[PDB]
Amino acid sequence: PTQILPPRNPVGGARVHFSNPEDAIEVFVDGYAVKVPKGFTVLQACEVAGVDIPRFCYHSRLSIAGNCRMCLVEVEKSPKPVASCAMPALPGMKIKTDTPIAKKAREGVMEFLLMNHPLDCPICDQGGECDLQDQSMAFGSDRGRFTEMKRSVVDKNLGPLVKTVMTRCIQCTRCVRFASEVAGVQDLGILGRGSGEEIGTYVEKLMTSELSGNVIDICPVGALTSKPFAFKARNWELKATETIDVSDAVG
Amino acid sequence: KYSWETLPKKWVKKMERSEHGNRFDTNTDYLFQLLCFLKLHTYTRVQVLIDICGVDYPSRKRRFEVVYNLLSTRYNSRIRVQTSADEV
Amino acid sequence: GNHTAKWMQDRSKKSPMELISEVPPIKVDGRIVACEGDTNPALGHPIEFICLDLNEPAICKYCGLRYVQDH
Amino acid sequence: VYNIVYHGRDQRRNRPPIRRYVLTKDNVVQMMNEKKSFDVSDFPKVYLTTVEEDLDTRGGGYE
Amino acid sequence: ALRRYPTGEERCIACKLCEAVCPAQAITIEAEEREDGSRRTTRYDIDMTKCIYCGFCQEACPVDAIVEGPNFEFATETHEELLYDKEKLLENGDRWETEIAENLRSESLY
Amino acid sequence: THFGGLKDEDRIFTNLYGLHDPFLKGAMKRGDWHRTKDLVLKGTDWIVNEMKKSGLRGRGGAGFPSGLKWSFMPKVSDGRPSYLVVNADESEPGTCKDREIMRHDPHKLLEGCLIAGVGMRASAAYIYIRGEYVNERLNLEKARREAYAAGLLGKNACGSGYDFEVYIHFGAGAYICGEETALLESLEGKQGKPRLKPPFPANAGLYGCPTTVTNVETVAVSPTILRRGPEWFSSFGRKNNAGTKLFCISGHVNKPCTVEEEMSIPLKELIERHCGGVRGGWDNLLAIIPGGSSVPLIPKNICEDVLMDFDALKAVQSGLGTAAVIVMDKSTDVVDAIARLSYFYKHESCGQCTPCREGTGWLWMIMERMKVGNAKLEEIDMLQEVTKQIEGHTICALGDAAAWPVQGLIRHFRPELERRIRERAEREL
Amino acid sequence: ALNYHLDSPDNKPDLPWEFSEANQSKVKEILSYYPSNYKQSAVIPLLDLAQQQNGGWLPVSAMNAVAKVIEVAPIRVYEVATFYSMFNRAKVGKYHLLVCGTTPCMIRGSRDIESALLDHLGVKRGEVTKDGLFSVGEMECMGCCVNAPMITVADYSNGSEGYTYNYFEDVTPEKVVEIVEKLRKGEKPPHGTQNPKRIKCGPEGGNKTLLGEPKPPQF
Amino acid sequence: IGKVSGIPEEHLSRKVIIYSPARTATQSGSGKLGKWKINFVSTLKWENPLMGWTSTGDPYANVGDSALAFDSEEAAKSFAERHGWDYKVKKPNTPLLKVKSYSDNFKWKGN
Ligand SMILES: Cc1cc2nc3c(=O)[nH]c(=O)nc-3n(C[C@H](O)[C@H](O)[C@H](O)COP(=O)(O)O)c2cc1C
Ligand code: SF4
Ligand code: SF4
Ligand code: SF4
Ligand code: SF4
Ligand code: SF4
Ligand code: FES
Ligand code: FES
Ligand SMILES: [Zn+2]
């Protein structure tokens, strides 16, 4: 009745790059059609729809993974919540990001992540700027039923840049993908299986690669943090200026 | 709500809400005229200006929003007539 | 120490770093410890589970206490 | 305690979205013509409150 | 008073939660990985004059590192003394620990 | 009708018990490699059609209709050489039906590699032997060297014009590596971590090349399905479910044995006839895990008249997986048995996805509490809810396979769990 | 079992390690199976070959050598060596008796199997005996299930030649201690069902199905 | 509307920067984007020599970030031009949602 719907622009003003304006696949994100290029994962078909789907290991620059199931939107006619990060949007697919099954799937997974995770948030360097804290305080449940012995992991020596507290790390594999692909040095690894999974070099091996300090921004958890910025500040104290850099001429 | 039926449609110009306290976001010209209504009216008797809350939205074009609260001691109801007037 | 020389100018009372580096590491049984705090789980720090796979003592970050495997 | 499903218990975000729909002149003239008469019970009820003298009769002065 | 763990070691890991929760922004915390490796506050200065004594710091602190001692008798001749220095005068809570530990052992039930 | 009776001339896996020679000169006598040249010459579409007509369903846990699975492979090869990974690796608790095909008549498995390869336009078969099957993969490499020397496999499929070679990979002790989307990776050289399904193995699986992962029993009955009658095969079992499953009656039966027998057989009939009987008589039965370990329990009140076919066991709120029926009698601690199953799923869970990686250690902790009684009567509803949080969300069906034993234990023996909890309560105070 | 490396004189990336002869040929064959590229596929067989060659465990030098042979960064080889359970990364003695422990064994006395084996050997669970001969290690389902309790020995005495991964199934505490003593005495006990009256995977009273002489059925 | 606003003269010749704060690189979440903020450079912050804490002198130290956040570059520019500031709008760098799929990890390197 002459409603005023919100604009529903992409999640971060993200420019959507059509390879051609012909193969635009049209999917329904919460009953609101969006035209996404062919090949867009459901997560990107929602980031085109302004819906911000909580992701722990899905980095746009990095490869796609299922190392955790924090996204689990419910598409129309699938028997199980599909991971939005890897499910390619098919034409006509109806994505329901806020249906009770999707929200229960998100709460389920954010309980598993916070289950074996140590209570290091006060002593965690990334305490304020944390995907895990900001997804638990927004999509995860308000309470945790796990009252048992969490697993704990020794702290690997990854050099004079990345302070490592692998107990906090959720084994989403984002860094072991960043070092293999973008940094291209292939030193980090997901050693072991099960909860015993440990991320880092199997032999004590400082991350000799440059460009491997960005694993901290890649890391959705405090685990991998800047050792130079050991604890000196907090995510809220820091006044940020959008400066440029002058060390190397890449600017 | 009875108040919206009798009120001249032009006076409740821009907006109208229906929870968290009902409001008639009106226009600055029809404001004191709208405040004349809702008071000195048999079925809407406010008589009590509780509050006049200036609210500043810098990102609007009409920056401020002079939120007149109004209690109706007779009918036990509270209406929040608003406006919008910039700095000048 | 040097960090402790920034906030403490007394330099006669032992620096907290030494007060915690002189307490012996606590033997335990398993591969994971609790270190809930002093004794009362509500008057100590959030429980921090420490791994004892290494041979050297693994300190508790919040309390400085040290735990060893004691196999 | 052992049932931590939240979206059912949620209060901050478990609310119907704001439905801000526009009225154009056609709608309000339709409504004014539809409102044929203001029969009683289309009027706001009065908050009736009278005063009545009482000394200590509520409970007998003992509450 | 900044509490301590029974075995020395200031209880104040520098999370900055009290610096964040403080309504008057009295607490100024600067943190540095000490040589031992465990985080600690190089600067923990509560400005008592710029402080509302609301106990938010006692609630926000995760390890009960900062608590309000029942002292309330610390009127100072000069304002500069009233600004409680970085972890040195708030470290006088060790004297008040015998009462602060009692109050915490009796209040922790709430 | 009334199923169960399979005559010795209808058992497909002759020399199951290794009584006769497994290799050639002992396999040709059992009909192996009989006239595969004609079959390969009969084409790929005919093989797929006869496999679909025979109604052969997946012998592995998935239970998918084979043949229809083989029709998923691309017809026109676009440069990617379609593979055929045979899922020899089992590692499912209770399941030895693969261990009696890798050894003890492996030539059926090799001929099935070839016949399914020509069936699904494949170009090489990677028999992913379970890592621990060292003697079994040694027998299978012996039979592979034989079928290479006898011109059966390699550069001419049994003298035909089909180039098809069987390579034998072997994992190393990982139930998770056995999964269809994880076999491809554990064979690609990487860790045995499943991949998500949106890329299906038939579209981009092994090395990115198309492939279909088939359990040895499905690929190994394929030869005799084609050489015998697809009508003869489908003449067994009920309407949809048809064939002769290779069972493994595992535990707490006075005569545990793996024996091939017609599907849709009454579970009680199988127990009472072949493996002897539930130790201490049928009235001593406590529960039965009818499939492998990836399937809920059967509390002996719906185990009398339940048929060992996919459809009926699915309709009984359970599943027929590898049909590795595990029997448990009134003497066992069923909660301890399911606790050890959940420990197994905690150990053999490649940890790639959060719902399984963490919630399975959680299920193991809750089961090792409830088996003592250290829990609270409302945790049995947390345990149900934890399992339902794991089930639909994991990358592969191992999440299922880890939430299903505990879900079945709750659903059926909730009286026993509640009894242990109340007995712990009364033990205190 | 640590999921990382602690250096030792026996085990460090400094030590030179490379496939011995009578194993370079196996390396070449294993790599011949899989294509020219994608030779990473051969990390499981090459790692198992290195484990057989080095007497039962994988030193970091061995993983580095497998990585050089297979041409991937050593982290990928380390990732696969810590993932798969059969790859022991610390010495497990000469035999490493693997007694299954899953439910189809647990209900059939496999806990008693392991306890008898442990108290006879005298090691906690996975510690190697002071004799350096034996070590016990729990393993999940080993396939030998109808053969109800089982124990797998991994003869690492010779190395890649006398490497026998025998299945001793249907065992009992007495059978297990007998097997261990006959193993320490040097000889190789006969694997398969340690319980006669049943053929392999048989119904324990003589098989009841496969009786008639095999023959080509009516095709 | 700069003169009627009571702001002192010396703070209406100020040079501002109307940016849109980029996403905090540490956390991959866009819930703080699209809020254009005037950035009064306000660089002058010494250290009050008695205690370790800092001490600004510019009145516009914090209000650039705090409590003054518009919702569109047009509203922010209209604001900084009413008050007579010399705004230099710094456009926000937005990400390309390049098409990507799972099946590209398992690509076949032909031979
Ligand atoms: C939880 C789980 C358990 C599995 N167990 C087995 C198994 O025991 N044996 C096997 O050959 N394949 C196993 N698989 C792989 C497939 O489910 C399926 O069995 C195989 O890919 C194809 O077998 P089919 O062609 O007979 O359906 C398992 C997969 C999953 C997800
Ligand atoms: S990453 Fe650090 S701050 Fe975030 S939830 Fe984990 S411990 Fe807390
Ligand atoms: S270290 Fe960080 S980036 Fe790497 S897997 Fe763990 S949480 Fe993810
Ligand atoms: S009571 Fe604590 S939090 Fe509150 S103003 Fe004072 S120091 Fe800050
Ligand atoms: S006093 Fe409490 S809130 Fe403040 S830094 Fe110390 S632990 Fe954190
Ligand atoms: S966590 Fe579970 S579902 Fe996910 S890959 Fe590992 S075994 Fe499969
Ligand atoms: S990030 Fe998409 S599901 Fe893990
Ligand atoms: S019980 Fe699973 S193999 Fe022994
Ligand atoms: Zn501690």
Author numbering:
A (entry chain C): 50 to 300
B (entry chain F): 8 to 95
C (entry chain P): 38 to 108
D (entry chain S): 67 to 129
E (entry chain D): 112 to 221
F (entry chain A): 53 to 481
G (entry chain B): 31 to 249
H (entry chain O): 39 to 149
Tell me what the authors wrote about this structure, in their words:
Complex I is the largest multimeric enzyme of the respiratory chain, composed of more than 40 protein subunits. The plant mitochondrial complex I has the classical open L-shape formed by the matrix and membrane arms. The main feature of the plant complex I is the presence of an additional globular matrix-exposed domain, bound to the membrane arm. It holds an overlapping position with the NDUFA10/42-kDa subunit found in mammalian complex I5.
During 3D classification, two classes of complex I lacking the most distal proton pumping components of the membrane domain—Nad4 and Nad5 and their associated additional protein subunits—were found to naturally accumulate in our sample. Using focused classification and refinement, we were able to derive an intermediate-resolution reconstruction on the additional density corresponding to GLDH which was sufficient to attribute the density to the protein. Moreover the whole carbonic anhydrase is slightly shifted toward the missing PD module. We also successfully identified the N-terminal tail of GLDH bound to the maturing complex I, between B14.5b and 15 kDa preventing the plant specific protein P1 from docking to the PP module. Thus, it appears that GLDH prevents the binding of P1 to the PP module, until its release, which will then allow association with the PD module. Hence, in plants, GLDH might act as a stabilization factor of complex I assembly intermediates that would be released just before the final step of PD module docking to complex I*.
